[PDB]
Amino acid sequence: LICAQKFNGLTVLPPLLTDEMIAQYTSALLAG
């Protein structure tokens, strides 16, 4: 359903921060 929504020019954009860097930030917060 995502590609059908994309194909009519309703294009989503990826976030600047991916999930792994968010996990790194959280791991740093737990360590601190």
Partner 1 sequence: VNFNFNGLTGTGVLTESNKKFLPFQQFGRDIADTTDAVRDPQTLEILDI
Residue 6 in tokens? 């994309």
Q: Closest approach of Cβ 14 to partner 1, in Å?
A: 22
Q: How far is the CB of 29 from partner 1 (least distance, A)?
A: 41
State the residues that interact with partner 1 by CB under 8 A: 1, 4-5, 7
Q: Which is nearer to partner 1, 4 or 29 (CB)?
A: 4
Nearer to partner 1, 10 or 16 (CB): 10
The Cα diameter of the chain in Å comes to 46
Helix intervals (H) in 1-32: 2-6, 19-31
